[model samples]
Target: NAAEIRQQFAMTAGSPIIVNDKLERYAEVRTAFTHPTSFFKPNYKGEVKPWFLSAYDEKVRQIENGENGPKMKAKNVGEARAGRALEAAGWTLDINYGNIYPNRFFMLWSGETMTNTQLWAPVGLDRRPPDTTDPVELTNYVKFAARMAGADLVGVARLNRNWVYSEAVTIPADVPYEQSLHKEIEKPIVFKDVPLPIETDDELIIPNTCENVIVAGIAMNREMMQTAPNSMACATTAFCYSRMCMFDMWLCQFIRYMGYYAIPSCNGVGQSVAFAVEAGLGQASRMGACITPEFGPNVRLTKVFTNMPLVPDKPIDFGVTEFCETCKKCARECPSKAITEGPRTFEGRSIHNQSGKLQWQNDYNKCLGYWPESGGYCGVCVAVCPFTKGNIWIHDGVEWLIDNTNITEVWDGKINTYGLDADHFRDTVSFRKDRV
Candidate 1:
């Protein structure tokens, strides 16, 4: 098994190809939300409609008539209502685009400095100190806290401003909740020697002191996610999103308690996949995801920017490029034909993609177009990835050291941290079991 896995996998440095030109960073808003090509598609009638809204209408009709579409129909009305309640609870932290910046409860400055600076004001947790100057100790301790905060896979990277957005979508602080939709706008994210998280009409400045970014890979449920393009798949996707929100709050607060400022950006601050790659969490894939040795493309990524001084992890080389070259499973299986079966290039295929990066490009609009039709967040690409397989998706370089080798008797202790103990790992989950 070990020899076969090694023979099949390929690994490379930084990325499969050398990045020569300027790979400009992009904002999330330029993706599915505002990108016209990715957001609008024609319906069954051949009339163009905002894809998601039209998908919603399709779902409403299906449910009203008791047709489950790709999902199983409930045995009775009561059962249907129970299912509905479970699905509803999954949206807890994602209402009104909770992942967006300035979403009323994202990383606010007072949130970063207020309570801790006040509680230990006289003692100066915020002033006059480096609690632990040892990067070794800090890296280990912070990673433990991150795991405790619900990150399945964690890594630290020196902040790369290039991956940070040139602008972010947000609403004004004074805007009422009722008008948040109307008030949404874009503002700049600039890095300067000024204090972190400073806001002005001109730009949102990130201070030089904010030197590190902590990237987290939250694992998705294999059984649930494999059912993508179905309601249960949506459930798992929704659950992970809520999990991400909790992780940000917990880790951000944990960092503050440790006397450092943490910027909690759920899906907002920058390109998560880029940070994940630099931090050794994964590699760029043809499917437009950060394919990791542990979870493949099935994992959801989130990151926190901080002034905390920690050891930066090195980039990893696990043959995603070689594997993706021959194994076109993701592109072949993509229902919307959105993914490209092409060579990696620095150019994009459409307005939805950010050019100037050495990677495969796809029409995100085509991907998003299928969501409403399926009545859920379809993860067919993630599901189809070979890395998403349970046994194949080993962590901590164990059962096959990241496209290198498989587990052996001598490799027992050298494998994943105790964080992989199934007992402990299973206990870390927090879906609303009582409600859902």
Candidate 2:
């Protein structure tokens, strides 16, 4: 029966059973950052900071004071130190988070600029046009490179500019970080050929010839992620942000090295989940994540857009909508009651969501509100999801069990401390015992 169901529901063309709406109506700005309920929240010092930055300050204070409060301490020495290391490394990629607009930083360059389209202009790798033009051969080669660049899954789609931001947040080009925040503004992204990703204090544009987006899903660790709403969980999240950053950069460089212009966008540029869906990597789910067959919503997403000739992948449907309708686990488990258990609609629960999209609209404001309280982003929805189990579940009856936790020996003292049985100790992270 399981085999039959799997075979029958592998996927469908263009996510045939799924519902979506105009990209024209989606607003990237009205999300958690600008939402009233979630946006003006009090920070650790009781001052208002956007949800994430406040959470960051919380982590910093806990690390300094060695607080073991609810979401403050790591479950074990492993979680604590490993968490710290990962958190530090994560920012190396996130340095561009604030200023990706006006095409200044990572969001720089598109079909026209072509990465060194001028400095290395002599060799003509870019000037002669893309050498790998055959769509069939190009697709295979590029997908291969994508995997090598750490993508767990890859897909291509004709560019849907709807996902692209109509107005991106940016600081004027010559401003300093301190002044930039106050100076930040929105500029329209237009399409027209230009050598570099340029800005004139008015608008941002790309080449009309720029077509096709390459989407990638980079998987995150399972064991570490289960520690939701805790420091270790935040650590896992932080690392993935960097992973997404690297994915776009490495792939973009590879595309350019092959003589095609590539635009690198980590968390900027456009909507990743939208592009991921169009590229057939997965189907939309109740929790508003792109539920991939392999990783469910456990993976981070990033994309690269180019003018290179390529064959587009068919969008897929693996019965996410059908399953989400029956399983309201995310909504039920959400601590802040942010996720909606109601039927899908084109209207939003709050301004944080896009209106006119035919899908479940959840209160992102409520979701972001919980971050400050928990001292970290709560991933209860992601953790308890039945799909996270390799994105699989029992259909008719049979269900499986999984878990962790403890203290004061209640059964196994040390093991419970880390939230998992450690009949085998020193295993959270290993470097090999034999030491050759």
Candidate 3:
């Protein structure tokens, strides 16, 4: 077991970002709730709740005035500056739309207004058809295109009944933006273990005919995130939100081009993490992040549900479960202590989390609480992750190790204000073809 852990350590040790106090402060200062400017009301019942409002109020009052959160504080101003920079970088791309809840934003529960929905009208793919066949070739073709659509990783799986939400709580169909904030509606999402799509009085049911699900992985820029508490960190996080939007549209179009129907849900699907794990992307980690072999938890995810036929990827066992068993770095570094400290369990800690499956479940409420106390969305976990470094190359005797080890020194070294290195972009490989 140590050999396996050592091998993983060796793989990550190729490049390590030196963590310090300023970076930690950046994680606190930029929290969405802490910065009044960054907070907004969710698109729910017409009133603005703090983006991290409730969480911020609780954490800020308990902690020292200049500290990151209640118990966490940065070591120095430089570390704080680095964290701010990383946060700013993440915020650069379409960062804030408040779609942490799946099937909500770019992810929609219904295909009614989408371009792909319009294209599928004639084929009746959304409804039942006489020739309800699974088109295997078309599925593979679209999946390949999804990877090219900016997804670092992609997988196809049958839409499992287990993963779908039992019910969806949404705004009324006729509620306008002004009225939307005042009203909320709950609808049952029922699926009959049948062979085609069916509609009931209160639910939309997809038959087994809806064969495949396509999952995509969008990676965040590492150097930018290492800046942690700065504007640059926010920029990187924001940029990926836009990237998710683009990926969904591109993949949807590709599926439509191949004579099949696809549903694009950026943030509107049932449960992305559940779907992702079932589709075999990676195991869930202690920090409530999905840990991939390639990007660790530094990647954002999006998905498309389709009737296209394709082969499903098998669940991977790259030793994440074993590694997470011993590695408590994220839990140790989390400011809110929202992440679970114990072993995996089927129980959930709050209303925000769904129970019933084994996982290192987090108290999303605790995580959200920290957002208000900081000025922006905090990503301390992303910055401190051993796997979040840029140089992830395997070591051979000749090459020794890749560069960029000390994160704080790099900031002190004036390596460019936002850690924007052209060489860093050289490592931005998104497809399997590039690897081969």
Candidate 4:
């Protein structure tokens, strides 16, 4: 049955985003080590370690002797410049990436240190009793506020039991930033499926009262990404991290304002990919990325988990599953050969992937390994995806076919360091309104 489904979903070949060997090399070299701008000290054990410093050392040794990794070499000056520019820009959002580890600058990892915790203390939602009784009215108001708080897309679903993580691997309570690197621990994140957010001796219990999940999609600049392997490309990527940071704080505050408790996770709590899929934001693709009709996988995602009442959006069926079935461009283009070339399966390739669902799972370690080597986070898969291109339009009698042919041309022409056009942002908002 799955095979038959796959056969029926195959797609036609689309235009390829032609990349030179130099660009390809740039992608590999700039991701982690060499990208000075992107390479920052992680707040591990309270000591800062350059995000990819160790990896950079290996890269230099490789390039010096005409090799690719510890022994790799840059083909030319353009390649060298590409690496430098990418590294500089990659550091654009070091402040935000550091937040991923929690207890760092933006990510506190604990509610005790958060402003929201103190602000909500008076509300008593954390204690036992609350003033609100009708969840329906509360849900509507909170959902509206979520949208106003800068969520391009928002949805609320009854917390599905299957979606919760069986365990959460987080740093220990007593461990500081410097000690975190060596003090990593895994704790079971069991949920009893109650009605509200609660705490227990062994679990961070989310009550069944935690009725809705608010999913948000933060947009990234198209023009900026087209300049992949460049400093400007890194800038756009970095700016979006800040956007995600803002989204969490803004939405969390909104929920608190609505007399409900909210948990803000910029890059925590649970798997974003799972939440995004459940929220109907997009379908999982061969690249192991969520491909949405709006921005494809070009967008970055962040969500807020709350006990607020809200309505959820239906899971969308755009032609992504069909398109990816036939279009193996991401697989063909992945430098690390990280994307799967075979059919989707329940088995995972590595520790980075979850294997229960039948989906195209990527080797995240392979993907992460490439980042340090490249000096920037390589988005080759995202860059090459046909859906990531601007190509959908309707036909009218007068125009016959609306102009969707410049998808390739536009990207090619704009592929320069930090090249951003207001025209593209204009089109983004315009296209956004059409979908709404």
**What is candidate 1's lDDT per residue for 236-320, written digit by digit as tens?**
6777788888888788777766777778777786888888888877788989899876567888898988887787766666678
lDDT of 2 by residue, 114-207 (tens): 4555666687555565666888778878887887677766888888776787777676778875676566676677887775445565776666
Q: Which should have the higher lDDT, number 1 or number 3?
A: 1
Model 4 CA deviation exceeding 4 Å by range? 1-51, 55-140, 193-202, 229-231, 396-436
TM-score per candidate, chains pooled: 0.82, 0.80, 0.67, 0.68
- Predicted candidate 3 versus true structure: per-residue lDDT over 42-86, tens digit per residue: 322234566645433433332334333334454554554554445
User: Which sections of candidate 1 miss by over 4 Å?
Assistant: 1-17, 40-51, 69-84, 112-128, 393-436
In angstroms, the error of model 2 at 288 is: 0.6
Q: What TM-score would you give candidate 1 relative to the actual structure?
A: 0.82
Angstrom error of the Cα, residue 384, model 3: value is 1.1
Worst 10 residues of 2 by lDDT: 427-436
Better of 1 and 2 by lDDT: 1
What is the Å distance of residue 101 in model 4 from its true position?
5.3
User: How well does candidate 1 match the true structure, expressed as C-alpha RMSD?
Assistant: 7.9
Choose 3 or 4, whichever is better by TM-score: 4
**Which regions of candidate 2 fall more than 4 Å away from where they truly are?**
1-23, 34-37, 64-82, 96-102, 110-124, 177-179, 193-198, 391-436
Per-residue accuracy of model 4 over 350-434 as CA lDDT, tens digit each? 5444445677867665666565555456687887877777655334644322233322233345543233344444433312212
Quantify how close model 2 is to the true structure by its C-alpha RMSD in Å. 7.6
